[PDB]
């Protein structure tokens, strides 16, 4: 099992999932408990809050990266406002590949719900995105998508070359190259069975990106229509620059 030193430094920024799961569900439980059953949150209202908490984890995770802290808050805000939706989808997908089983959905809190139950409550747009995500979850499981490659895709998503108006773009470029290099070496080395895993890994990023776009727009509109409950930063995320 060969692991490039660069990848080793990336895994150190991953939070402790077992506790953050307790943090989130311990938070959601109290919220519902503070309300009579006329006040209780819908299934959508609850899904909104889990994502907000996940973003708090994402921000704290991003703030833990040495490369990220080398930027000024200006450049930092521009990278997050460009990938926050794609990271959320990515983390959800990886949660299914790891702890998820077909026909079931696993949440950040660790709760295992039936896909059919949750799907029958979503509109046509969400169902198409959810199933499309399920399709990607299956392809990645066949490729034996591991945690080491998961963190690489996160940084690749975070440090986008399509981000414009950056003060230190060269810094973003170097990180892109260093991560692409480390991933390739690790993939071809630890997975000679799939000679093409790396080439196929990068292929899914645009697909996860597209899903991120359609979903981000859908919520921006629902928020404009007032159908989105207030969830702190998640609102200003869409409330600013769409």
């Amino acid at each position: 099992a060969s692991i490039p030193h660069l990848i080793l430094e990336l895994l150190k920024c991953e939070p402790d999932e077992p506790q953050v799961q307790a943090k989130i569900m311990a938070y959601l439980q109290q919220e519902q408990a503070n309300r009579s059953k006329h006040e209780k949150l819908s299934t959508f209202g609850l899904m909104c809050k889990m994502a907000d908490q996940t973003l708090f984890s994402i921000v704290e995770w991003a703030r833990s990266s040495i490369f990220f802290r080398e930027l000024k808050v200006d450049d930092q805000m521009k990278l997050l406002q460009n990938c926050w939706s794609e990271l959320l989808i990515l983390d959800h997908i990886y949660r299914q590949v790891v702890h998820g089983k077909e026909g079931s959905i696993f949440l950040v809190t660790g709760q295992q719900v039936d896909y059919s139950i949750i799907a029958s409550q979503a509109g046509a747009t969400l169902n198409n995105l959810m199933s499309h995500a399920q399709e990607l979850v299956a392809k990645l499981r066949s490729l034996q998508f591991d945690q080491r490659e998961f963190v690489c895709l996160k940084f690749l998503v975070l440090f986008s070359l399509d981000v414009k108006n950056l003060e230190n773009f060269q810094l973003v470029e170097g990180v892109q190259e260093q991560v692409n290099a480390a991933l390739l070496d690790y993939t071809m080395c630890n997975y000679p069975q799939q000679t093409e895993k790396f080439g196929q890994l990068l292929l899914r990023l645009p697909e996860i990106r597209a899903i991120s776009m359609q979903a981000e727009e859908y919520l921006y509109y629902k928020h404009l229509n007032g159908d989105v409950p207030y969830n702190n930063l998640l609102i200003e995320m869409l409330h600013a620059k769409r």
Partner: peptide, 10 residues
Amino acid sequence: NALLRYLLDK
């Protein structure tokens, strides 16, 4: 956007 800046600017 000012809230996000507060989280980063901390």
